[PDB]
Amino acid sequence: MIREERLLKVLRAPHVSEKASTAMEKSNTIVLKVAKDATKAEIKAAVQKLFEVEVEVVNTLVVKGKVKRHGQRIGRRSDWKKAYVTLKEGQNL
Amino acid sequence: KAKELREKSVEELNTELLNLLREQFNLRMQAASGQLQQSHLLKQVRRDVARVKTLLNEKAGA
Amino acid sequence: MKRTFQPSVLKRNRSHGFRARMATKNGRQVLARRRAKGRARLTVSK
Amino acid sequence: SRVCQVTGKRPVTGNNRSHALNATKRRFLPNLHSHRFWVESEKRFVTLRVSAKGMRVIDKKGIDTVLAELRARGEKY
Amino acid sequence: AAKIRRDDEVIVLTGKDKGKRGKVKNVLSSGKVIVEGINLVKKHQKPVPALNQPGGIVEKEAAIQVSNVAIFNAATGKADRVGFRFEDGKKVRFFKSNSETI
Amino acid sequence: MENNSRTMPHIRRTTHIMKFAHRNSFDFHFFNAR
RNA sequence: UAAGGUGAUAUGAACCGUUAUAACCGGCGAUUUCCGAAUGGGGAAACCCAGUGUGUUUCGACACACUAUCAUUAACUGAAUCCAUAGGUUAAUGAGGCGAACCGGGGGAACUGAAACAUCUAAGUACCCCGAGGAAAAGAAAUCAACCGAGAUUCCCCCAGUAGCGGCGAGCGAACGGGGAGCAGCCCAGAGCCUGAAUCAGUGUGUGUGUUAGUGGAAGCGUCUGGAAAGGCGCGCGAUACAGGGUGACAGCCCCGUACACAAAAAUGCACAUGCUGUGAGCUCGAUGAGUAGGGCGGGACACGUGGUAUCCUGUCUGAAUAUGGGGGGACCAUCCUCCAAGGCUAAAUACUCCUGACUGACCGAUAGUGAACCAGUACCGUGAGGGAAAGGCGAAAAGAA
RNA sequence: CGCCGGAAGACCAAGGGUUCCUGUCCAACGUUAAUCGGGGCAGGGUGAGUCGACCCCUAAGGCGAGGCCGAAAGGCGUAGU
Ligand SMILES: NCCC[C@H](N)C(=O)O
Ligand SMILES: [K+]
Ligand SMILES: [K+]
Ligand SMILES: [K+]
Numbered sequence: 001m002i003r004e005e006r007l008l009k010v011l012r013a014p015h016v017s018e019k020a021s022t023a024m025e026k027s028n029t030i031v032l033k034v035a036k037d038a039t040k041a042e043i044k045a046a047v048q049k050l051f052e053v054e055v056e057v058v059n060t061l062v063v064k065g066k067v068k069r070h071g072q073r074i075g076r077r078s079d080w081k082k083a084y085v086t087l088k089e090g091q092n093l
Numbered sequence: 094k095a096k097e098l099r100e101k102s103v104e105e106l107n108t109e110l111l112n113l114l115r116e117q118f119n120l121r122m123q124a125a126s127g128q129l130q131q132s133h134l135l136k137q138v139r140r141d142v143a144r145v146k147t148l149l150n151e152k153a154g155a
Numbered sequence: 156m157k158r159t160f161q162p163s164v165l166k167r168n169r170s171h172g173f174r175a176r177m178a179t180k181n182g183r184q185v186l187a188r189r190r191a192k193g194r195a196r197l198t199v200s201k
Numbered sequence: 202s203r204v205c206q207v208t209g210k211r212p213v214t215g216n217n218r219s220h221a222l223n224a225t226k227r228r229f230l231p232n233l234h235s236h237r238f239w240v241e242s243e244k245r246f247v248t249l250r251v252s253a254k255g256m257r258v259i260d261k262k263g264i265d266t267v268l269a270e271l272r273a274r275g276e277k278y
Numbered sequence: 279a280a281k282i283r284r285d286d287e288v289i290v291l292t293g294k295d296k297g298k299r300g301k302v303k304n305v306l307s308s309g310k311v312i313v314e315g316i317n318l319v320k321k322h323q324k325p326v327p328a329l330n331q332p333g334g335i336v337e338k339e340a341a342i343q344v345s346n347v348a349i350f351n352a353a354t355g356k357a358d359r360v361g362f363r364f365e366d367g368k369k370v371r372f373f374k375s376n377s378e379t380i
Numbered sequence: 381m382e383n384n385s386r387t388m389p390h391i392r393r394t395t396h397i398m399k400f401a402h403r404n405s406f407d408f409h410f411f412n413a414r
Numbered sequence: 415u416a417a418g419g420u421g422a423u424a425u426g427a428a429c430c431g432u433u434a435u436a437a438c439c440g441g442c443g444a445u446u447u448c449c450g451a452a453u454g455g456g457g458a459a460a461c462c463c464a465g466u467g468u469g470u471u472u473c474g475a476c477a478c479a480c481u482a483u484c485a486u487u488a489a490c491u492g493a494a495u496c497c498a499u500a501g502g503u504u505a506a507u508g509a510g511g512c513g514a515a516c517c518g519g520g521g522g523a524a525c526u527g528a529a530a531c532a533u534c535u536a537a538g539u540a541c542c543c544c545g546a547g548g549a550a551a552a553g554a555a556a557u558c559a560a561c562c563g564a565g566a567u568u569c570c571c572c573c574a575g576u577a578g579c580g581g582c583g584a585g586c587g588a589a590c591g592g593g594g595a596g597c598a599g600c601c602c603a604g605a606g607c608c609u610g611a612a613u614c615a616g617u618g619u620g621u622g623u624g625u626u627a628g629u630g631g632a633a634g635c636g637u638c639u640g641g642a643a644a645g646g647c648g649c650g651c652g653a654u655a656c657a658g659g660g661u662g663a664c665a666g667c668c669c670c671g672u673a674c675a676c677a678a679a680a681a682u683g684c685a686c687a688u689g690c691u692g693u694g695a696g697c698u699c700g701a702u703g704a705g706u707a708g709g710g711c712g713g714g715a716c717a718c719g720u721g722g723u724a725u726c727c728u729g730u731c732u733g734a735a736u737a738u739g740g741g742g743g744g745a746c747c748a749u750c751c752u753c754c755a756a757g758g759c760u761a762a763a764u765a766c767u768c769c770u771g772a773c774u775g776a777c778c779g780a781u782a783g784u785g786a787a788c789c790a791g792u793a794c795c796g797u798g799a800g801g802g803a804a805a806g807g808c809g810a811a812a813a814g815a816a
Numbered sequence: 817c818g819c820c821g822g823a824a825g826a827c828c829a830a831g832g833g834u835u836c837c838u839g840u841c842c843a844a845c846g847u848u849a850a851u852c853g854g855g856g857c858a859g860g861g862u863g864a865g866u867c868g869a870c871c872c873c874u875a876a877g878g879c880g881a882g883g884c885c886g887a888a889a890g891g892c893g894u895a896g897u
């Protein structure tokens with residue numbers, strides 16, 4: 001398998017948007033913010049255990065951080081990974 | 094703490110380490126959904142994992 | 156008209172990148188000089 | 202390099218002095234030759250890169266005495 | 279090692295409120311104290327529509343320097359200075375003028 | 381080269397501007413005192 | 415050590431603590447992603463791909479460890495080729511890279527000066543390279559002196575801009591001897607007796623002292639001016655403390671300190687003392703560093719440019735005598751004096767400061783002083799090496815204007 | 817109404833890096849005004865067994881265990897990579 005302490009650190013947050021809420025209504029897909037070095041096999045095994053649902057497939061993408069100018073310092077936000085987790089059609093959440 | 098956890102052995106410390114990481118995952122989901130009012134709980138659980146992993150190493154490598 | 160700077164990231168890293176500087180002794184003295192001056196960018200890298 | 206294996210001679214620098222005493226840098230090289238020496242103690246020929254003066258050291262000391270200082274130096278033949 | 283602490287009765291030695299008495303609300307890491315009814319300012323407070331707080335001329339206490347107050351010896355009725363001595367195992371503060379423990 | 385100009389940092393070689401014999405409209409018949 | 419805390423811009427939120435498990439400071443530990451000598455292979459630095467061995471498994475997979483090169487030593491193997499050697503595999507130990515100056519060595523300019531310029535100068539300087547240490551190098555006379563004597567090396571002041579060298583031009587420039595700082599001598603080229611008798615190196619323990627957090631630390635109010643008193647006037651007190659800083663204007667007595675007196679659970683530097691391992695002192699006898707000294711030819715170093723040129727070093731060619739003997743005393747010979755080359759080790763006086771602490775200045779005060787008092791080697795310029803700024807001040811308190 | 821239409825249309829590589837979309841603002845930036853913008857501020861947006869990279873294989877060429885050579889630094893090159 002995997003380690004359960006590895007599982008307890010992969011999933012970070014649920015992502016909130018109009019695309020994230022449309023994907024749950026019509027496509028049966030939750031959108032999550034996951035760890036940056038997480039794999040698709042680690043995300044699938046974490047959702048099936050910590051949420052106790054059945055996952056069909058995981059699609060991931062890396063979001064690039066934006067360059068913001070706070071005052072006069074030119075800064076940059078960090079990158080993060082986003083996962084599209086498709087549940088099976090007998091689902092929950 | 095740190096004296097109540099010195100009077101447990103390695104498997105009871107492994108049991109408590111997993112319980113602290115389960116609570117740390119549940120505080121993350123409440124804080125990221127705008128549902129956690131007591132934000133001081135995030136620092137407490139984080140530094141108790143550091144206490145348990147400190148004691149596990151000074152029982153094994155010592 | 157055609158000017159002198161025509162950018163190419165592969166030719167940039169092969170000519171003055173970090174491993175190109177570390178490959179000869181004279182390139183390693185470039186990095187020692189730039190560390191001694193205290194520069195925020197050592198090489199032309201990513 | 203141009204180094205004698207027995208005596209340790211190597212190129213040294215000096216001057217070309219002309220009749221008007223113009224000085225130009227030159228080198229002095231050792232008179233190096235590669236030569237195979239018979240080792241009676243081993244029934245084997247050993248090739249060394251020696252100067253002509255280093256050949257006279259071997260003729261005086263013997264080839265086994267010379268090869269022992271070559272091991273003690275850490276030289277590899 | 280601090281001579282003026284919280285909840286102490288102090289008297290002001292310097293300024294517009296010189297000679298008045300009060301209790302220390304808190305000590306600050308700047309070397310300043312906030313004393314009740316001492317060093318009052320009027321802050322023109324802006325309104326913000328959260329907090330349910332409207333604006334107004336609010337009167338609050340400003341921090342005075344800690345060397346500008348002294349401990350008030352209630353027995354003598356004067357400003358006194360503070361020393362340190364070991365009664366039991368532990369350090370205490372006492373008044374300089376009569377060597378009595380605070 | 382002029383490498384640290386603060387008034388014009390974008391340009392290093394500027395004598396095509398004010399030196400008359402280096403302008404693009406210089407003709408060698410201006411140099412007829414020969 | 416403590417009644418207050420959760421670093422800053424920088425508030426707020428949510429909390430912790432108040433007589434001791436809040437926070438803060440110090441010693442010893444734990445953790446310590448990836449890149450970088452980077453070391454499992456590769457690579458456009460912070461990335462890509464593995465091999466082997468254990469352990470796990472819900473059978474899909476996971477977790478940990480090891481695997482670079484070279485040198486030295488050992489083991490097992492192993493050709494042409496009979497013995498063998500070369501080579502191969504494995505194991506142990508070490509090295510690698512970085513760093514401001516100082517040190518030793520290997521190479522080594524030109525501008526310039528000569529009122530041109532080639533010998534000469536600049537200068538063995540700049541620079542490049544290798545190596546080492548807290549210092550390095552040198553060092554215990556084949557040295558000087560002068561018929562009297564001195565006594566290893568290094569550094570300082572004289573000797574002396576002298577004696578000399580020099581297109582005898584520009585320039586270069588000693589030694590002898592004298593005064594100081596510091597002071598130290600040994601070992602192998604070998605046997606016998608006596609053994610482990612001096613010394614050194616490592617470690618343990620004890621003692622002393624220092625460092626890495628700290629503790630205590632004296633004595634002032636009345637009045638006038640003023641926004642505010644530390645100032646003016648009046649009367650007191652402390653001082654082994656009137657160094658310094660802060661506080662609403664200039665404070666010995668308001669605060670922090672200062673003189674002085676104390677402090678270590680733990681780590682560590684020196685100073686002895688002692689335990690252990692390693693080392694072996696002393697007597698007699700013997701021995702006294704050979705392709706070397708010297709020479710011819712070509713160069714270089716000595717203040718000394720080949721000159722009448724001693725002495726040292728050696729690229730090349732030669733080549734002795736062995737204390738009944740050799741080296742030197744500035745061409746060379748005789749006499750006399752003095753010292754033993756061709757093996758090695760050695761503290762102090764000396765050089766330097768990237769860094770840490772204290773203190774000082776007829777040093778600077780924002781176009782000055784570091785390029786940089788401010789988020790500066792930044793913005794910006796350049797393919798790159800590299801170049802490189804501008805920019806300090808409300809008030810006592812934000813009381814920063816409801 | 818006028819202009820391009822083997823482009824002044826469409827899709828990419830290289831290069832750039834959020835300029836994309838939505839809301840809001842108009843000091844400065846835009847050679848004028850601006851309610852607008854590639855400007856300021858906030859939020860959102862990039863979903864792969866089959867496309868591309870990575871990967872397997874090599875060219876020119878680079879590096880190169882041993883090796884050969886060179887005052888030193890280094891040069892060339894075999895097996896390989
Ligand atoms: N190589 C081109 C550099 C361009 C530069 N701004 C110049 O004026 O030279
Ligand atoms: K010969
Ligand atoms: K090294
Ligand atoms: K010259």
Ligand SMILES: [K+]
Nearest residue numbers: 527528529530
């Ligand atoms: K001249």
Ligand SMILES: [K+]
Nearest residue numbers: 528529530531
């Ligand atoms: K001339």
Ligand SMILES: [K+]
Nearest residue numbers: 557558742753
């Ligand atoms: K002599």
Ligand SMILES: [K+]
Nearest residue numbers: 655657672673
């Ligand atoms: K004093």
Ligand SMILES: [K+]
Nearest residue numbers: 659660665666
């Ligand atoms: K004062």
Ligand SMILES: [K+]
Nearest residue numbers: 707726727755
């Ligand atoms: K000699």
Ligand SMILES: [K+]
Nearest residue numbers: 720723724725
């Ligand atoms: K001579």
Ligand SMILES: [K+]
Nearest residue numbers: 780781805806
């Ligand atoms: K200024």
Ligand SMILES: [K+]
Nearest residue numbers: 785786803804
């Ligand atoms: K400046």
Ligand SMILES: [K+]
Nearest residue numbers: 842843849850
């Ligand atoms: K406008």
Ligand SMILES: [K+]
Nearest residue numbers: 845846847848
């Ligand atoms: K314009």
Ligand SMILES: [Mg+2]
Nearest residue numbers: 057058059864
């Ligand atoms: Mg799909």
Ligand SMILES: [Mg+2]
Nearest residue numbers: 060061863864
């Ligand atoms: Mg994808």
Ligand SMILES: [Mg+2]
Nearest residue numbers: 065076077078
């Ligand atoms: Mg960030």
Ligand SMILES: [Mg+2]
Nearest residue numbers: 452453455456
């Ligand atoms: Mg590598």
Ligand SMILES: [Mg+2]
Nearest residue numbers: 452453454455
């Ligand atoms: Mg690697």
